[PDB]
């Protein structure tokens, strides 16, 4: 073996001065950037519902592309998360192994440079550090729920998708065939700020669900044939119902504007 | 011994300071 006449050792244990430097070694927290992205995508969803003409089809490709984009972005966030986790574990292991390795003096300088003493090398260990993998892909936002279901919702807005409440399971959500009512079962009114129940997936207008539960702490689900005892906290904003009602109302508004104009042309 | 005493003192001081500033920032959290 060609010993190091270059007294720089191949590997050295953690020197305390750089132990401090090593403390500063970390992957940057990009989760703020990802939250900004997720907020932008949610606003994109809302404005996509707001603008898209319900009489015009062809948003399925838009939603699918943004679906793939957001899955890719969540994958990147997860890669960074697993990268940070691997950095933490790698730092812990490197510190333990280096501290298990003799500290550096002239004698250990010669031993480490000649290979007599070997210590973990953060460059080498970082190469040996597990590659950033998707760790907890951020799919649990309402973003991927809409980006997944919105082609089909565009094909038919009133369709019931019963597995929109669990974005935590990253398996593809199997949409069951159904139609969610466009009228509040309580007030018999179209949804304005609809609240969905996490227990039975029945969605009611916020005013309607508040009125049904008014005067009592918890009451049964207002939808017919449902006995789920629910309260205001049990109901959370339903982006899906807002999307459905919004699309339906916009289609009706286009129809009504054309009908009202001809309705005046009659007089 | 003096060194470790100083380190522990500063650790406690700056831990308290970090918690306080974290609470302050949580307060600091927060057209048509």
């Amino acid at each position: 073996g060609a010993l190091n006449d270059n007294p720089i050792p191949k590997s050295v244990p953690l020197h305390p001065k750089s132990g401090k430097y090593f403390h500063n070694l970390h992957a940057r927290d990009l989760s703020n950037i990802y939250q900004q992205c997720y907020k932008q995508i949610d606003e994109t969803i809302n404005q996509l519902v707001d603008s898209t003409s319900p009489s015009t089809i062809g948003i399925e490709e838009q939603v699918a592309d943004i679906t793939s984009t957001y899955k890719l972005l969540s994958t990147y966030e997860s890669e960074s998360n697993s990268f940070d986790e691997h950095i933490k574990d790698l730092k812990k292991n490197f510190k333990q192994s280096s501290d298990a390795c003799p500290q550096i003096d002239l004698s250990t300088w010669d031993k480490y440079r000649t290979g007599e003493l070997t210590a973990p090398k953060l460059s080498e260990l970082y190469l040996n550090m597990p590659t950033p993998e998707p760790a907890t892909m951020v799919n649990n936002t309402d973003t991927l729920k809409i980006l997944k279901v919105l082609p089909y919702i565009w094909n038919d807005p009133t369709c019931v998708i019963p597995d929109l409440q669990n974005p935590a399971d990253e398996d593809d959500l199997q949409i069951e065939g159904g139609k969610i009512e466009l009228t509040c079962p309580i007030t018999c009114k179209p949804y304005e700020a609809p609240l969905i129940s996490r227990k039975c997936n029945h969605v009611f207008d916020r005013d309607g669900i508040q009125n049904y539960l008014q005067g009592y702490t918890t009451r049964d689900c207002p939808q017919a044939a449902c006995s789920q005892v629910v309260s205001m906290r049990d109901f959370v904003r339903d982006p899906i119902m807002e999307l459905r009602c919004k699309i339906a109302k916009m289609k009706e508004s286009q129809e009504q504007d054309k009908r009202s104009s001809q309705a005046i042309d009659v007089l | 011994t003096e060194k470790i005493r100083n380190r522990q003192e500063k650790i406690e001081r700056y831990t308290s300071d970090g918690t306080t500033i974290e609470a302050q920032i949580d307060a600091k959290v927060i057209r048509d």
Partner: protein, 49 residues
Amino acid sequence: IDDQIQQLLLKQRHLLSKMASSMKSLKNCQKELISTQILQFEAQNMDVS
């Protein structure tokens, strides 16, 4: 209005793809920067030793 809107949504998906690519660059270059940073740390460790 409808078709202009559909164009806007096409812009949505396109710029989202741009964001995804730039986020790939984001995460990968963050990993790269901390890689050379830990390499610098190793060199400095050897230096102070």
